[PDB]
Design a protein around this ligand. Structure first.
Ligand code: GTP
Ligand code: MG
Lengths: 113, 165
């Protein structure tokens, strides 16, 4: 694993505790650490300011989902964000295309909201 | 009553910091914004819906997706970044040439005034060529996003612009 640890999780598109393992660019969520995905090769990832009142939360957005993960502290959140970022194998062109499409969808939703 | 604001500028200028300083009264942890944050800020009986749009070079082509319906433009400049001030000028001018933004007033935040030898508002005015903007109300406001200095007077100016139309 590139990184693993407990995170509180809830989808946008109640919180439950999940054991999360990032392998390659696949994010695995396990109910039980003892019994071990979301592809993050093409994603947006940022600090959640207003989707939650909780601190230390990152918002993950892909073509298939949008969800919140709460880390133990600021450094843990930052370490998760960075490792997820670093896991993508997409080139500059494909990064630009996927970023464009994910952002444009997000603008549309917030122009509605 | 209400005012739609587009807040743009080069990456690292302090835009997200400004938004949440205003919205939450906090100095938030940030990473480069790939996309946008949007918040409504209530100030002196006006509801400012502020779009904080990422300024990384590769996503500047996306700025155009936010132009329609903006009443005020906030352009944030890192006053410590002498290396990229002309680049900031060029990006600003490109945006100001867009017909979707013809009616938008322009607020320039000369941010990071706390940093040693930061360019003052007078210098930024000169380096951005702001006087050449003869067909648009514009105003420059020196700021420190982390302390909040300058931020409310910027909102004062925007408020007067709304009120006067
Ligand atoms: N010294 C100083 N640092 C500041 C000030 N405002 C913001 N910063 C810092 O500058 C860095 C970049 O700030 P951000 O708000 O993330 O910049 P941004 O404009 O949103 O950048 P993009 O998301 O890439 O568009 C952060 O480390 C901030 O804490 C300021 O007034 N003074
Ligand atoms: Mg930002």
């Amino acid at each position: 694993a590139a990184k693993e640890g407990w995170l509180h999780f809830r989808p946008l598109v109640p919180w439950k505790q999940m054991y999360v393992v990032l392998r390659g660019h696949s994010l695995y969520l396990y109910k039980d650490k003892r019994e071990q995905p979301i592809s993050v090769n093409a994603c947006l990832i940022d600090i959640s300011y207003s989707e939650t009142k909780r601190k230390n939360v990152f918002r993950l957005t892909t073509s298939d989902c949008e969800c919140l993960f709460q880390a133990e502290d600021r450094d843990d959140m930052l370490a998760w964000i960075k490792t997820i970022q670093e896991s993508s194998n997409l080139n500059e062109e494909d990064t630009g295309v996927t970023n464009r499409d994910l952002i444009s969808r997000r603008i549309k939703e917030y122009n509605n909201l | 009553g209400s005012m739609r604001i587009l807040m743009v500028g080069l990456d690292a200028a302090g835009k997200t910091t400004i938004l949440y300083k205003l919205k939450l009264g906090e100095i938030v942890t940030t990473i480069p914004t790939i996309g946008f944050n949007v918040e409504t800020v209530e100030y002196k009986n006006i509801s400012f819906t502020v779009w904080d749009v990422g300024g990384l070079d590769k996503i500047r082509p996306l700025w155009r997706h936010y132009f329609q319906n903006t009443q005020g433009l906030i352009f944030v400049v890192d006053s410590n970044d002498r290396e990229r001030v002309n680049e900031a000028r060029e990006e600003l001018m490109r945006m100001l040439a867009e017909d979707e933004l013809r009616d938008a007033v322009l607020l320039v935040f000369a941010n990071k005034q706390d940093l040693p030898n930061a360019m003052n508002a007078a210098e930024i005015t000169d380096k951005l060529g702001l006087h050449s903007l003869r067909h648009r109300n514009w105003y420059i406001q020196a700021t420190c996003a982390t302390s909040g200095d300058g931020l409310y007077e910027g909102l004062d100016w925007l408020s007067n612009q709304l009120r006067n139309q």
